[PDB]
Design an enzyme around this catalytic site. Sequence first.
Site, PDB file in Angstrom:
ATOM      1  N   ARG A 207     -65.786  28.756  57.456  1.00 40.49           N
ATOM      2  CA  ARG A 207     -64.006  28.225  56.086  1.00 40.49           C
ATOM      3  C   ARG A 207     -65.325  27.280  55.383  1.00 40.49           C
ATOM      4  NH1 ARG A 207     -58.409  27.358  57.692  1.00 40.49           N
ATOM      5  NH2 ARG A 207     -58.860  27.072  55.478  1.00 40.49           N
ATOM      6  N   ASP A 232     -59.626  25.484  63.150  1.00 41.62           N
ATOM      7  CA  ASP A 232     -60.342  23.894  62.511  1.00 41.62           C
ATOM      8  C   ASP A 232     -60.344  23.394  64.509  1.00 41.62           C
ATOM      9  OD1 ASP A 232     -59.262  24.648  60.647  1.00 41.62           O
ATOM     10  OD2 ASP A 232     -57.671  22.783  60.482  1.00 41.62           O
ATOM     11  N   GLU A 503     -55.402  17.376  49.965  1.00 40.90           N
ATOM     12  CA  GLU A 503     -56.811  17.713  49.118  1.00 40.90           C
ATOM     13  C   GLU A 503     -57.354  17.928  48.118  1.00 40.90           C
ATOM     14  OE1 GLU A 503     -57.795  20.627  53.552  1.00 40.90           O
ATOM     15  OE2 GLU A 503     -56.576  21.773  51.296  1.00 40.90           O
ATOM     16  N   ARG A 519     -53.493  19.119  46.451  1.00 40.36           N
ATOM     17  CA  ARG A 519     -52.783  20.052  46.660  1.00 40.36           C
ATOM     18  C   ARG A 519     -52.309  18.798  47.435  1.00 40.36           C
ATOM     19  NH1 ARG A 519     -54.909  22.628  53.099  1.00 40.36           N
ATOM     20  NH2 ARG A 519     -52.658  22.536  53.516  1.00 40.36           N
ATOM     21  N   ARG A 581     -51.291  32.719  51.456  1.00 40.47           N
ATOM     22  CA  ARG A 581     -52.709  32.276  50.511  1.00 40.47           C
ATOM     23  C   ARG A 581     -52.910  33.669  50.230  1.00 40.47           C
ATOM     24  NH1 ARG A 581     -54.996  27.567  54.850  1.00 40.47           N
ATOM     25  NH2 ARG A 581     -53.598  26.024  53.421  1.00 40.47           N
ATOM     26  N   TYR A 615     -58.846  29.169  50.985  1.00 38.20           N
ATOM     27  CA  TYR A 615     -59.909  28.106  50.170  1.00 38.20           C
ATOM     28  C   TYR A 615     -61.233  28.351  48.827  1.00 38.20           C
ATOM     29  CZ  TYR A 615     -58.194  24.091  53.478  1.00 38.20           C
ATOM     30  OH  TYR A 615     -57.406  23.086  54.119  1.00 38.20           O
TER      31      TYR A 615
END
Length: 658
Positions: A207, A232, A503, A519, A581, A615
């Site tokens: 990622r 994460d 971000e 963001r 997304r 992303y």
Amino acid sequence: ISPIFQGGSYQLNNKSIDISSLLLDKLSGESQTVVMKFKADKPNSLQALFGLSNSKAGFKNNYFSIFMRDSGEIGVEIRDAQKGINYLFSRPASLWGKHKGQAVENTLVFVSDSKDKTYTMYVNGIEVFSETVDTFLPISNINGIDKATLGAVNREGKEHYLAKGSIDEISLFNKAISDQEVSTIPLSNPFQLIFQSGDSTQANYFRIPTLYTLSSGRVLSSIDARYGGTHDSKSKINIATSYSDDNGKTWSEPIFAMKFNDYEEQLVYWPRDNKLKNSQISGSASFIDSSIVEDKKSGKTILLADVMPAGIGNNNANKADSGFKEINGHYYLKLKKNGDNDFRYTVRENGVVYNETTNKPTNYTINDKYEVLEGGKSLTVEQYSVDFDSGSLRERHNGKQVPMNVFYKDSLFKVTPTNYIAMTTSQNRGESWEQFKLLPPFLGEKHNGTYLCPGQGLALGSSNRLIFATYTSGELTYLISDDSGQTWKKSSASIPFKNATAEAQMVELRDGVIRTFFRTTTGKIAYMTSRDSGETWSKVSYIDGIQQTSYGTQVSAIKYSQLIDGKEAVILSTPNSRSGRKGGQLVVGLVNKEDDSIDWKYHYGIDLPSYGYAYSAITELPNHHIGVLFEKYDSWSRNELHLSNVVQYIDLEINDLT
Ligand SMILES: O=S(=O)(O)[C@]1(CNC2CCCCC2)C[C@@H](O)[C@@H](O)C1
């Protein structure tokens, strides 16, 4: 082995095609391979591409099907009511829809293997599932099968799961072809992989892509190599890099820029079921979210990333502590020794471990790799490995000794359980990376470190200034260096959100003028401008014409080197969607020379509005093409966790965008 059936150029226009006569009596034995090249750029919500069924009254649940969804998901059903078997295997985000305005030919290979009792699906050269069962059901051994169908499944005489799309080629074989044989089937992929399962990282997941074009023409990429599924931190994650010397056509085998060894680098198939999918490696140290810049002065490449001590992530990091102690204007890393209830130690110059209750040096030092030495001798800890052999996640010692590091669970001396930022540098443009150093705190002793904005840092064109965007509650915190990253200062810019994942990525519009795109939690991408090389920042504005979800997604951004329609151009990469997304776009904006406002003039759809895009990383290649490395799936959705080989790279030309 030759096909027992081959056919092609079938149009599926919400009307199935009956191929029973051609296919059914050719099927024999209990193992089969289906090879299918197909396009579907306007799929129905849920549609079968291929079906074998009992079409008779009373047997509606007796069929095999290969199906897809308009989300990009592919799968099969294998069902026989008499045998009491209803198998469904699938994986989200397995397909392409369109590329450069053309429907993509997907290449699907399904293997039904009675000997190993295993069903395996490949799409576009990527294994999307492989499932072994106790009771194998051969696909043409379903009780009373009497129909072979394209573009639907015939159930009780009626067309279920009607498809819109095309099957350019379909072939079946009365054999389970080997993985080796599968690898020889030619593909028509619109993308390539830079990082992938089974590569040198041995991470099954990736990622947070970055891309950066170096002055030599080398294009460099970094990424989270994530071992414990796509979670994460807390987890085990390293930072990996790869580069291309031929404008993105080929890429070097990855190496690590930042790694910990408290846990083994294991290629693991992370469970995706609802009971276990939140299983998370809980005792490993990790790195997360990297960012790259090149320094014109030294020629060094610089890479930063967040660092998490063992068992730590954003959710449990101590927010009220930097992890450093201020002593005479300077900051020193705090350490807790095994047994103590406080941090009674610090790391001073040359790594000397100092005792704070007695202000005396100890016989312990910390080397350049943040490893612990006693009397100059390397201490060690036993490494961990993970497994699901017992049915749940277990983390256990594996017999191997590794250098004892202050970021580890088992270390004699441990750092504060909070987040840090580290930096490493390379002197050979990504061929090797130095040992990382921790950056100092920028907002005081009692404030946790800020969070690095993944992607690119910014090298100013008319000075030696380097800037890395970071964020924390209530502000963007830009890190600024004018001496090749030897020293850093902060420049704080308030934003109107608390606890946002802000971000941010920057572009230099003209000499000393930086626009930062970021963001938010408003469903709109925001920006601010600096006109003094990052010293001061404007109020925040918002971009209209692009939608994000309430939680938002990272946005990547570059200044294009060439004029477009006679104007300076900036390019943004982001999902365009209020729902999830997905709907990836490149958006091309032209700068108004009179007020620095931007007219977002062109929108390029990376793939279908309903297909995943999270992303992303973009860079202008040395030949003026655009490279895009991006998460081709919904990395927010709890239905799309732990997918392999979804971070993908494509090459575009400006004319494709406009
Ligand atoms: O202008 S830079 O900031 O040095 C940079 C490179 N531009 C070159 C010069 C023009 C040809 C290819 C790309 C833009 C960033 O997105 C990084 O890829 C680095």
